[PDB]
Amino acid sequence: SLQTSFVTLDEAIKITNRRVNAIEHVIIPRIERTLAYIITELDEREREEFYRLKKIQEKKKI
Amino acid sequence: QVWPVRQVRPVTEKLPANHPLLTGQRVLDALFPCVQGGTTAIPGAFGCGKTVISQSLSKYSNSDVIIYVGCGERGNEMSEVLRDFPELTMEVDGKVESIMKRTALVANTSNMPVAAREASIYTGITLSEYFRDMGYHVSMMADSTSRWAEALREISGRLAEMPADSGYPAYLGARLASFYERAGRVKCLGNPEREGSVSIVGAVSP
Amino acid sequence: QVWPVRQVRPVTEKLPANHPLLTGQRVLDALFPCVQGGTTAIPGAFGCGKTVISQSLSKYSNSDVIIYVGCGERGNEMSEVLRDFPELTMEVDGKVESIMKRTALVANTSNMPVAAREASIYTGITLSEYFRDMGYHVSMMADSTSRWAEALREISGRLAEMPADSGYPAYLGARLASFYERAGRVKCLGNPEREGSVSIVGAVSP
Amino acid sequence: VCLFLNLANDPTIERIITPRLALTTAEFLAYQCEKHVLVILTDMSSYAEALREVSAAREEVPGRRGFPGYMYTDLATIYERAGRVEGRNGSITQIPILTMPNDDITHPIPDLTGYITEGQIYVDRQLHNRQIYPPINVLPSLSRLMKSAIGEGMTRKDHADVSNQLYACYAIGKDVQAMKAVVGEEALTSDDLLYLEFLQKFEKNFITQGPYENRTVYETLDIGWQLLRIFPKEMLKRIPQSTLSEFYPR
């Protein structure tokens, strides 16, 4: 009984380890890079609108 | 002859495409070919060397004339084009002739002025139409029209115009559409009943 | 004598920093030493302990004067250094003495109009330079660096300037260069040929 | 050696002129004095910052990251003053080094600089974190004019094939390391271990050079063949057969 359970456990151990390693190596950096890209792009777009507002008030100076 | 560049030359009646364009590359021929009359794009970041594709297509084709327009590139590429194209030769009728006897080039390096970038592309397309009015098959090729768009952005910016998106003037999309429209097979205007076509391949620098 | 803030007092010549800035503890004094008259960054936040290095450089170091300059400071630090003057003494000749004599405190608390809050750093560096010209050694604690960038943003708020990055004025780099560079060891300008240096320690506050 | 130093004390607007002083002196020395010239332009990022400030003084139109829209044209004006000219003998070379904020290759400055230029070297942070000098990565490095620079008559016939296959093996090894970092030892194969051994030898010998040693080109090619010898000649896809016939048995 002891050795039967012991031979069975290893496959589950390997499955769990590969899943944890994948979650630590692939999924997280990708989403982090996307978060950086999205924040910088939104900042760019707010900036473009800001420049538009700046130039209209410049013309309104006349 | 003298011709206003902006105005599109007239024609008799457009015809459908019925024959492919020979491609010097294995890929994008058996998978995604371009017809003798179609329009194409070749965008991509730097490091790919789309100029390789441009030169390879220019060297090997079944067309009668070739026109290559450079806009905002390196001078090294034009040195390559001038030095190498003379040496290559092919023939169909006996004597072995150089391929620059069927090629015409327009030149604008990146250091050149700003609006000459527009002048080059418009001169090139007008020349392509004029040679199409001889009842020939002519291919055309571009180089980083995004530089042309950038030049228009700059000039319109100094004119104090509304930017539309990313700073680019609103009418650029319409300008690009009108530029790419003048192409495809067509029946020429003349009693001799000649017939020719134009193919265009355009490059973009995102 | 009176000296305008926005100019650098002259020096005969600038000598390379070739000596270590002593620190109280063997940690960060044998692993990663600093150089006398150099420029250094130290991360620091609330609760971590930032006055530990301040006091260490005030008591156990080879410098000669400490000028502590910050932004949005509290009376806690003011009274703490005031009481550390008679408590945290130094037995230079076996006798304790108030470290008030070896300090000249400068600080601004939120309230202060952003002009003065931004002028504090230049007042401090001017004072440090006036003291280094006397042939001594100095350590200028450029505390509250992130708050100082905030002060730069705040002064540019009333200028309608183009946001370089999240509101940073275009001349942010100019101000960084004009501040951090005025340091090092210099041969003084006079007959008896003194020598002295100013260090700057910009406490990073991410 | 002629210097045009620009200390940080100097006014910001002064930085616009200095590169053009260097380049016009270089052009004179290269097309009037008939001398080979080498140009080094340090910290183009500071020049970009100065250009941004001068442009913002007049409230001009931005592009990405608030930089001037005509920054591409300006950088082209700076860089395109290079090459060789007919009827002369001298030349001009440029090594326009720049700084790379936050290690982002999509930032406008390095992107436009790469567009105007024809290559890159990409000094690498992780190799410097392993304390190997010079820390040079080769995965992104590009010299587009190698096509005509190399070959017999300059160095040797099979230099190009050596470079191509060595690079192919390098890329395959990096992919193998990335794949091993996830799947585990049991999901590998012997070929992967051979590529890992190649990497071991490659980074630990070929890349590491030494500050003051002037290596020789043919020594580099001999070490290249040493590295290529490791694998069976059949796996060398990107080399033609005749090169293997001439050089593999050596």
Q: Which amino acid is at C32?
A: F
Q: Measure CB to CB from residue C160 to each of A43, A47, A54 and give the nearest one.
A: A54
Technique used by the depositors? cryo-EM
Interface contact flag, D9 C164, Cβ < 8 Å: no
Local structure of residue B134 (DSSP, 8 states): T
Local structure of residue A25 (DSSP, 8 states): I
Cβ proximity of B13 and B186 under 8 Å:
yes
Cβ proximity of B170 and B162 under 8 Å:
yes
Binding residue per annotation — C85? no
Burial class (CB in 10 A: 0-12, 13-18, 19+), B29: middle
Task: For residue D92, list its beta bridge partners.
Answer: D37, D83
Secondary structure E strands in C48-194:
65-69, 137-142, 184-187
> What is the SS3 assignment for A41?
helix
Distance of CA D20 to the CA centre of its chain: 24
B165 to each of B44, B169, C153, D75, how far by Cα in Å? 21, 7, 27, 24
D140 CB neighbour count, 10 Å cutoff:
13
Interface contact flag, A51 D62, Cβ < 8 Å: yes
- Give the Cα-Cα-Cα angle D17, D20, D23 (nearest 5 degrees): 155
B54 CB neighbour count, 10 Å cutoff:
21
Binding residue per annotation — C107? no
Interface contact flag, D69 B157, Cβ < 8 Å: yes
Q: Distance between CA B198 and CA B126 in Å, rounded?
A: 11
Q: How far is C17 from chain A (nearest CA, A)?
A: 40
Interface contact flag, C173 D49, Cβ < 8 Å: yes
Interface contact flag, B167 D69, Cβ < 8 Å: yes
Q: Which amino acid is at D10?
A: D
Burial class (CB in 10 A: 0-12, 13-18, 19+), C142: buried
Buried-exposed string D174-185: b where 16+ CB fall within 10 A, e elsewhere: eebeeebeeeee
Helix pair angle (B145-158, B172-181), 10° resolution: 140
Q: Distance between CA C192 and CA D5 in Å, rounded?
A: 32
Q: Measure CB to CB from residue D66 to each of C163, C171, C178 and give the nearest one.
A: C163
The DSSP H or E segment spanning A35 is: helix A28-60
Helix pair angle (D108-116, D71-79), 10° resolution: 40
For every residue of chain D, DSSP letters joined together read: -------TTS-GGGGGTHHHHHHHHHHHHHHTS---EEEEE--HHHHHHHHHHHHHHTT--B-GGG-BTTHHHHHHHHHTS-B--TT----EEEEE----GGG-TTSHHHHHHHHHSSEE--B-HHHHHTT-SS-B--SS-EETTHHHH-STTTT-TTHHHHHHHHHHHHHHHHHHHHHHHHH-GGG--HHHHHHHHHHHHIIIIII---SS----HHHHHHHHHHHHTTS-GGG-TTS-HHHHHHHS--
The DSSP H or E segment spanning B98 is: strand B97-98
For chain C, give the number of residues.
Answer: 206
Contacts D66 to C, Cβ<8 Å: 162-165
For residues C97, C99, C104, C110, the Cα torsion angle rounded to the nearest 10 degrees is -140
Q: Is B touching A (3+ C-beta pairs, cut-off 8 A)?
A: yes
Local structure of residue C8 (DSSP, 8 states): P
Q: Distance between CA B102 and CA B65 in Å, rounded?
A: 5
For residues A29, A34, A37, A42, the Cα torsion angle rounded to the nearest 10 degrees is -140
Phi, psi of D237 (to 5 degrees): -70, -45
Cβ neighbours of residue D24 under 8 Å, at least 6 residues apart? none
User: Would you state the structure tokens that stand for residue C189, as one six-digit string?
Assistant: 């300008």
Contacts A51 to C, Cβ<8 Å: 162
Q: Distance between CA B202 and CA B93 in Å, rounded?
A: 32
Cβ neighbours of residue D216 under 8 Å, at least 6 residues apart? none
Distance of CA B73 to the CA centre of its chain: 15
Q: Measure CB to CB from residue A43 to each of C160, C162, C166 and give the nearest one.
A: C166
- Give the Cα-Cα-Cα angle D69, D74, D76 (nearest 5 degrees): 115
Give D 172-201 residues with CB within 8 A of chain A: 181-184
Cβ proximity of D188 and D180 under 8 Å:
yes
Interface contact flag, D181 A14, Cβ < 8 Å: no
Q: Which contacts of C157-161 are long-range, i.e. CB under 8 A and separated by 24 or more positions?
A: C160/A54, C161/D56
Cβ proximity of B170 and B164 under 8 Å:
yes
Burial class (CB in 10 A: 0-12, 13-18, 19+), D135: middle
Give C60's Cβ-side CA count (13 Å radius).
9
D30 to each of D25, D84, D92, how far by Cα in Å? 9, 9, 7
Task: Tell how strand B39-41 and strand B97-98 pair up.
Answer: unpaired
Phi, psi of C15 (to 5 degrees): -95, 145
Q: Distance between CA C172 and CA D49 in Å, rounded?
A: 10
Distance of CA D234 to the CA centre of its chain: 31
Q: Distance between CA B77 and CA B29 in Å, rounded?
A: 25
For chain D, give the number of residues.
Answer: 250
User: Would you state the structure tokens that stand for residue A17, as one six-digit string?
Assistant: 């380890």
User: Would you state the structure tokens that stand for residue B194, as one six-digit string?
Assistant: 């000649």
Please name which of B64, B52, B168, B154 lies closest in space to residue B113, comparing C-alpha atoms: B154
Contacts A26 to D, Cβ<8 Å: 182
Q: How far is B116 from chain A (nearest CA, A)?
A: 28
Q: Measure CB to CB from residue D59 to each of A18, A44, A58 and give the nearest one.
A: A58
Cβ neighbours of residue A17 under 8 Å, at least 6 residues apart? D184
Q: Is C touching D (3+ C-beta pairs, cut-off 8 A)?
A: yes
Q: Distance between CA B43 and CA B203 in Å, rounded?
A: 6
Burial class (CB in 10 A: 0-12, 13-18, 19+), B110: buried
Max CA distance (Å), chain B: 60
Buried-exposed string B63-95: b where 16+ CB fall within 10 A, e elsewhere: bebbbbbbbbbbbebbebbeeebeeeeeeeeee
Q: Distance between CA C197 and CA B158 in Å, rounded?
A: 49
